[PDB]
Amino acid sequence: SNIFKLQIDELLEQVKLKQKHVLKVEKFLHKLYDILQEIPDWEEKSLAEVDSFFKNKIVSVPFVDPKPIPQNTNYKFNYKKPDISLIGSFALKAGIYQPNGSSIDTLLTMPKELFEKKDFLNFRCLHKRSVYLAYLTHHLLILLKKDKLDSFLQLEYSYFDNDPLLPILRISCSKDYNFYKTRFSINLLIGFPYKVFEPKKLLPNRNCIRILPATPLYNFSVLSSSTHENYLKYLYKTKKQTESFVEATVLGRLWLQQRGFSSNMSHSGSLGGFGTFEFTILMAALLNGGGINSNKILLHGFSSYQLFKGVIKYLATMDLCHDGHLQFHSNPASKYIDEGFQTPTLFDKSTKVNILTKMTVSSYQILKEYAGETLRMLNNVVQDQFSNIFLTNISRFDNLKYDLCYDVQLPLGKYNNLETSLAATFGSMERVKFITLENFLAHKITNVARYALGDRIKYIQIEMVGQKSDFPITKRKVYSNTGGNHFNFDFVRVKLIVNPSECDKLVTKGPAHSETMSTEAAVFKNFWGIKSSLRRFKDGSITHCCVWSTSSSEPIISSIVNFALQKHVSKKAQISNETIKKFHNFLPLPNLPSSAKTSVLNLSSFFNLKKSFDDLYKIIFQMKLPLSVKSILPVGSAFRYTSLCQPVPFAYSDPDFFQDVILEFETSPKWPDEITSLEKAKTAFLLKIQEELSANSSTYRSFFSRDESIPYNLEIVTLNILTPEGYGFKFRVLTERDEILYLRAIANARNELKPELEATFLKFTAKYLASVRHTRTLENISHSYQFYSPVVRLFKRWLDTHLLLGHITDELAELIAIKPFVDPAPYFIPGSLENGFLKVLKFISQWNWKDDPLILDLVKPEERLTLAQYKGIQMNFTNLRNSDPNGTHLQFFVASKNDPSGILYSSGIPLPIATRLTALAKVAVNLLQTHGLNQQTINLLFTPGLKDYDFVVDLRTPIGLKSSCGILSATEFKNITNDQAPSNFPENLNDLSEKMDPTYQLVKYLNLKYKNSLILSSRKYIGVNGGEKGDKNVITGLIKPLFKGAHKFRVNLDCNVKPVDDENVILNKEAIFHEIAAFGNDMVINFETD
């Protein structure tokens, strides 16, 4: 805890202006409460004359639903001089600079002689409050208009905490005396006196309003309006106890406003419910109580970080909702009791209200989980994430926070049009359990969502987009027609984070079957109805369940929430989602039996490939060699489940077809000395095994292949097995002599080819030695991180459309995609393709190069890298790129446990390609944060983005490669590709080139030829982005900033030349494009300049 205190003080120093900008607004409120002190009063009045007294003016009166009919009018109104209290947050001086501004708590308390012993029923006290606020705000705007400062200052009606039971006054300004340069509002509230009554008519376990159901928001709102001064007395006595409270609450304020947990409500269908002032209150109660023995939990001696981690630990692992809550009394131990109130709860024995009742069970669930993971990521000592714990607005982009989102577009209409529009209840019995239509609608949506999905979702949240708490003065409500209804939401957004293990289980096992039909069986029958059934499973038990026809273009949770809303909330509430359907099938649809009907978490193509590999494995073992196989093991992309297309049998044309398996022989000393002879002996062994394979097992076939990726030994030969199941394998022999041969070469070579030969050794140990450990670790991790395989497939697709796969390799993409899966520090472990893909994009837009080494510890949830190895990785990084200035060639640095060097997978790619990747990530994240997430937004993201830079050359091989690549093109006729995918390896084997595509080898040889003067990118997976017919590819590429203008020629300028000046030549574009076209007359068709 040596750098974290300095980080805390610097986080404070991010906002330490609590003296300069506080004085002018506090003298503004000084004038304001002087005016309130000199407001002249009024005596008792009648509703049936103050209605016309406000009708004839422009100002009108708000109301709790509904307006009081004079048949029940027996209350006596008043308009008195209020005792005004400037209390709360900026009385404590806990300043935070916000774009929407903080607010000083200021309350017009009620005088003692306009209430009685029955102010707890039929909302006539709230109607008094509405008319009292109406006349006091008319009086205040009259006094402002006579004082003549109206031009800068204005006043608005608003709800307190987005709640219609308490409308309040939002004092704001506009563009000598104009205030525009600090927190842009204060809020005038109106409250009730303290000593009123006793808890039996004050608890949420009573009722006197007419039909005894619970009245929770009613006796929370009026009790917090009446009795909230012991809170301030206790707050200042804890302020006198310890000094860490103001830094503690600004810490919690930054925490909860980056979590988006403002003080509105979760009952209203909004994120929040929990508040920063409730955080202060619970912290002040936890400095004395919280233990099982009613212990002092937080001592009032230590500093702010310890009590902050204490309150996070208490609301992380100790329960407040279900099993247990903390009772308390401000005015003498505070006791944790083990029973629960089935609500987010803590109890008062000197106030007798429940301070967490502004939030629901779902918001308390998500807050307890956030507290648990933030306790977990603050406890760990191997790496500090203060900048990941307090410097990330995860609420700025909402779909980054949640796994998936749906929209409810419902035109229900009128408050009296309720019955035929929605299929839920109606009456005073529900209108005293809840408050309004949207409140009980949101609660019903939570209940039907959690009973519709069960434990197929981690956590559920629900909000009302189109909500407007800023309703004007002359209007009695937010009286807005929000697209089909007269209620305050444009549509209803339901967000889920889902349990990715059983996220797509196609049946949902409800309750078991018996003769006596139990109550949960009746619940399940009445809840599902026409799609419920009772089935026997294979073990023999009988369970009520519901089958779901799964699909590839959807998750089944879409259809489940569709049916379980169109059965319960409304039979016309249309569910609209298109983002999932748009880039959930951007993965290439593999031409398999029923693969459109199968899900996306199915890996049966990979498992079929591994079954064919096990057949080849047994055949290659139980033969006989002069030096038998020690260990054969695959290393390929299908074996690590990150091939772009799922491997269908007989798909020749995919460049990810030939997976590589390596085999190591016994450690024999009789291997030869030099590299050409030992590689030739490896060819001898491969010739032997293919000879015996064609001898004994004629159903397989073999053909050799030269390799060129390991440079400066042209004699490296692999064989490729074409298996009768339909897959191919590329066999590479590894020997024990190889890495010591390369180290022999490194040691004895000349002293200027050392980094060149080190780059050769880097490519060798990237292809042979450490890639085994890489595929083992990620293949082990791809079963606890389920969505890793689709997010790597989608990222490889997206990077192929944005033209980087020619230079960049697979392992960078895989470690990039495993970064948000293993490091959930602002977020969760991603359980949807959408959330995972934009998590990856947000991260690599955030990604620095000079001060962000990418360290990974590839491990399942709940081993890692130790502290000494982490310091070693950091020292490797800092000496590596302080000797390196800014990455002239070493752009990316990606370290793991498998490779502590870091440069193993990133060495080789050029700075234009790396900068293009980072700038394109920045383009994508600002495009998503401003243009909004939409289907057209997603398709415009997945445009190729040529961004025409010096050439685009358009290719055409004579065959549209979808049939031989094995992806149906969303064709409605399955038979027309079932008879077209050539499900037989050809008899002659020299046709594989012309049924394949050569464009990657052409652009690779061209890039290594012109490596100094122009880089060349291309597409390589031609079937997934080369048009619907799948026949198009480009060769794009940048010219070097040296070779923009002309350059004087020498013997080593290394370029094709156009000598027009006798000294300063230029590269002849017509000649280089024409030798490209001579190289690809059968391949290229078009050329475009500019």
Partner: protein
Amino acid sequence: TSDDYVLRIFAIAFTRKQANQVKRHSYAQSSHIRAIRKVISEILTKEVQGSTLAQLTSKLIPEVINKEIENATKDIFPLQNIHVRKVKLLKQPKFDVGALMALHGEGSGEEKGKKV
């Protein structure tokens, strides 16, 4: 292992009577015994730690760390038949239902007809 399994993996070894020998003994000098035990613990520690448990089974079945021990240890002593004879698991990581289903093949339990 590369997973979180831990193995008390064993190994047994025997002195070969060398060919063209005469003496009945064929005894190890007990300072060769420390060398053989050091190199055998080192190489089978490498063979475990560079592998997962499924890979450890698929390389223990066709009896290949035995021949690897004999090849890397025939330099010091002739060493009649080598075996491993015991692998005892002492701590298991977690369940990982998906990984266990991946070790066999996938499967999705689905409907049977109600008819009532």
